[PDB]
Design a protein around this ligand. Structure first.
Ligand SMILES: Cc1cccnc1N1CCCNCC1
Ligand SMILES: [Cl-]
Ligand SMILES: [Cl-]
Ligand SMILES: [Cl-]
Ligand SMILES: [Cl-]
Ligand SMILES: [Cl-]
Ligand SMILES: [Mg+2]
Length: 348
């Protein structure tokens, strides 16, 4: 067990191993507090997240366990990884606090798509890396569910990592009105049409790719209904085959109240883009999720010919998510979490 030291940072007690020095606050939220630090063991400028009220309810205890399981599993160059996890507790009986440690991220995609000139070669490399990371995530039967520019970290060398997986955390208020939290979401999840699956993430990649090519949000809706009208004007209204897959009768009645519209010509929307980029966007931005291109299929598209290497696009180890259907007490979720903190092994 390392030696721990205590300090107060913006109204909060932090108790951390001596290895972590020069702690300085970075962010605050409902789910945790974050400090930057220097890790003397590794030499990395690390990010440290302290969880708030991790075991306050059954829902909160299960979310803590879910986040720790997911983040310990993810071992890929284009995905967030865990450098460390710890608690100052010496036993289950005194266990209350959980701290998570990652590499400190600088810029997000927003910080390079807002203010920088992107060549077609930059768009190829950035979207290639997102799809490489998604092939790995989807091979474990994990859905990210919240891909958007603020959840993609990018360094000075245009190297990219996916972060901030959806832990089923977003509220109705967060998704309301003229908000980036909804502009990248697939229409079937935005409007609760049907059981969604991993195809929702490919819709989000299409929205991101379009915005890197134009410098403008693809579907900046002022509310759910405005955003659906923007989507159907580009991709066309649904045919009988998709309407049959929408489970809500009222959602089906509403769609049928709209005048029919054909799919637009994407070469006339993405004026002057690489024809291979236009082709790939037509394969991602398909209304019927069964018909969208997958991450593994997209990596083999001719748009990525200068980067694609089928011997350097790894899949994940199998991921057991059977706990998601399990009914447990707060103290049972807390014991499961404790076992996962104490069994952690750091990366090489
Ligand atoms: C520090 C941390 C721990 C666990 C999960 N995510 C974390 N962060 C990673 C990127 C930096 N921004 C904030 C989130
Ligand atoms: Cl230490
Ligand atoms: Cl990482
Ligand atoms: Cl504790
Ligand atoms: Cl964003
Ligand atoms: Cl597993
Ligand atoms: Mg985020």
């Amino acid at each position: 067990r390392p030696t721990f030291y205590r300090q107060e940072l913006n109204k909060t007690i932090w108790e951390v191993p001596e290895r972590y020095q020069n702690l300085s606050p970075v962010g605050s939220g409902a789910y945790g507090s974050v400090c930057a630090a220097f890790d003397t063991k590794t030499g990395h400028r690390v990010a440290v997240k302290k969880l708030s009220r991790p075991f306050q309810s059954i829902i909160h205890a299960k979310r803590t366990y879910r986040e720790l399981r997911l983040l310990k599993h993810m071992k890929h160059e284009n995905v967030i990884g865990l450098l460390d996890v710890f608690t100052p507790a010496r036993s289950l009986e005194e266990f209350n606090d959980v701290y998570l440690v990652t590499h400190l991220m600088g810029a997000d995609l927003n910080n390079i798509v807002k203010c920088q000139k992107l060549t077609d070669d930059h768009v190829q490399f950035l979207i290639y890396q997102i799809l490489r990371g998604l092939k790995y995530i989807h091979s474990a039967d994990i859905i990210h569910r919240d891909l958007k520019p603020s959840n993609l970290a990018v360094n000075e060398d245009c190297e990219l990592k996916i972060l901030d997986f959806g832990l089923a955390r977003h509220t109705d208020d967060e998704m309301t009105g003229y908000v980036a939290t909804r502009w990248y979401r697939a229409p079937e999840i935005m409007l609760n049409w049907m059981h969604y699956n991993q195809t929702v993430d490919i819709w989000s990649v299409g929205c991101i790719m379009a915005e890197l090519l134009t410098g403008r949000t693809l579907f900046p809706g002022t509310d759910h209904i405005d955003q659906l009208k923007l989507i159907l004007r580009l991709v066309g209204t649904p045919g009988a085959e998709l309407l049959k897959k929408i489970s809500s009768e009222s959602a089906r009645n509403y769609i049928q109240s709209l005048a029919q519209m054909p799919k637009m010509n994407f070469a006339n929307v993405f004026i002057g883009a690489n024809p291979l980029a236009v082709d790939l966007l037509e394969k991602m931005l398909v209304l019927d999720s069964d018909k969208r291109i997958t991450a593994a299929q997209a990596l083999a598209h001719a748009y990525f010919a200068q980067y694609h290497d089928p011997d350097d696009e790894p899949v994940a180890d199998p991921y057991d998510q059977s706990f998601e259907s399990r009914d447990l007490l707060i103290d049972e979720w807390k014991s499961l979490t404790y076992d996962e903190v104490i069994s952690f092994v750091p990366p090489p």
